[PDB]
Amino acid sequence: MQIFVKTLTGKTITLEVEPSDTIENVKAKIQDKEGIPPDQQRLIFAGKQLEDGRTLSDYNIQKESTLHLVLRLR
Amino acid sequence: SHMQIFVKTLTGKTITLEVEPSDTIENVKAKIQDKEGIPPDQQRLIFAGKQLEDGRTLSDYNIQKESTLHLVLRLRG
């Protein structure tokens, strides 16, 4: 289950994730790779702003799907 | 003495900052960290299509009051 996370500058990272993983889990994995705290991350899929508590299956995020990472200011 | 500038991400999300023309780009990054908690190393700042260098000042780039700098996330590797 290899999904992609795309920044606003073209750069894209790959993540190995399991169907049950929550969006928060996804943000933790991104912190592990990029050092960006989850609270500073906004994730978008299919024009939707993703919620931390939900899983990738609740958004029908399939293998090779591409999520969008956006900076989240206070 | 002081002036307001905007720092904007690519989504249009904006932050306002009070700065001096004599402030360094690193000073601006540190002010952004103070406001947003984003470490300087994660920040790349852009103005007039020129990547901004930590050691230079705002006046070096002729950044004026109400000018807008763009903020971009810096990734690892």
Q: What is the DSSP string of A54-68?
A: SBSTTTT--TT-EEE
B59 token code pair: 């006046």
Could you tell me which of A44, A47, A52, A3 has the C-alpha nearest to residue A23?
A52
- How many pairs of residues across A and B have Cβ atoms under 8 Å apart? 45
**Sheet arrangement for strand B14-19:** B14-19, B3-8, B68-73, B43-47, B50-51
As a whole number of angstroms, the distance between CA B7 and CA B15 comes to 5
B46 token code pair: 């852009």
Domains of chain B: 1-77 (3.10.20.90)
Dmax of chain B from CA atoms? 40
Please report the sign of the dihedral spanned by the C-alpha atoms of residue B17, residue B21, residue B25, residue B31.
negative
Q: What does this entry list as its resolution, in Å?
A: 2.2
Instruction: Find residues 37-56 of chain A whose CB sits inside 8 Å of chain B.
Output: 37, 40
Strands B3-8 and B68-73: what pairing? Answer: parallel
Q: Is A17 helix (H, G, I), strand (E, B) or coil?
A: coil
Residue type, A48: K
Experimental method: X-ray
Are A70 and B37 in contact (CB < 8 Å)? no
Residues facing B4 on adjacent strands: B18
Please report the sign of the dihedral spanned by the C-alpha atoms of residue B24, residue B14, residue A29, residue B34.
positive
A39 token code pair: 């609270």
Q: In a mutagenesis test of the A interface, which of B11, B45, B72 is the best target, namely the one with the most A β-carbons within 10 Å?
A: B11
Residue type, B49: G
Please report the sign of the dihedral spanned by the C-alpha atoms of residue A27, residue A68, residue B13, residue B64.
positive
Strands A12-16 and A2-6: what pairing? Answer: antiparallel
Residue B3's φ and ψ, nearest 5 degrees, are: -155, 160
Q: Is B9 on the interface with A (CB under 8 A)?
A: yes
Residue type, A32: D
> Is the Cβ–Cβ distance between B3 and B21 less than 8 Å?
yes
